[PDB]
Design a protein around this ligand. Structure first.
Ligand SMILES: [K+]
Ligand SMILES: [K+]
Ligand SMILES: [K+]
Ligand SMILES: [Mg+2]
Ligand SMILES: [Mg+2]
Ligand SMILES: [Mg+2]
Ligand SMILES: [Mg+2]
Length: 69
RNA sequence: GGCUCUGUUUACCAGGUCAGGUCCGAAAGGAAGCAGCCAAGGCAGAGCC
């Protein structure tokens, strides 16, 4: 379960936008998204880095649930 | 070394086109710009000079 799976699953638009600014490697392994990539993704999606942090957290909470359920 | 062909590789760090998202505007209209793709660069094989 990665960001591609989360992608398929104005807030929803904002969330898809952040994923749209990512490279395929970032969507496949979100853990590689550190400071520099967050900044690139944020500016590229018209968001603030804090918005990218919230999206990544939500993705993480979902991945954790899927791993279980 | 150079050029060409072919394969492959490359988040951002002055290229092009820029979906989505963003920004300015009441609108008409504009703008910046990530991903992708393209170009280009990296690593090689081959050919030519
Ligand atoms: K090549
Ligand atoms: K682009
Ligand atoms: K952009
Ligand atoms: Mg680039
Ligand atoms: Mg550009
Ligand atoms: Mg648009
Ligand atoms: Mg408006």
């Amino acid at each position: 379960f990665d960001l591609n799976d989360f992608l398929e699953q104005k807030v929803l638009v904002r969330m898809e936008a952040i994923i749209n600014s990512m490279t395929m490697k970032e969507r496949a392994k979100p853990e590689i998204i550190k400071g520099s990539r967050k900044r690139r993704i944020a500016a590229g999606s018209g968001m603030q880095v804090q918005d990218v942090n919230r999206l990544l957290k939500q993705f993480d909470d979902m991945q954790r649930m899927m791993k279980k359920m």
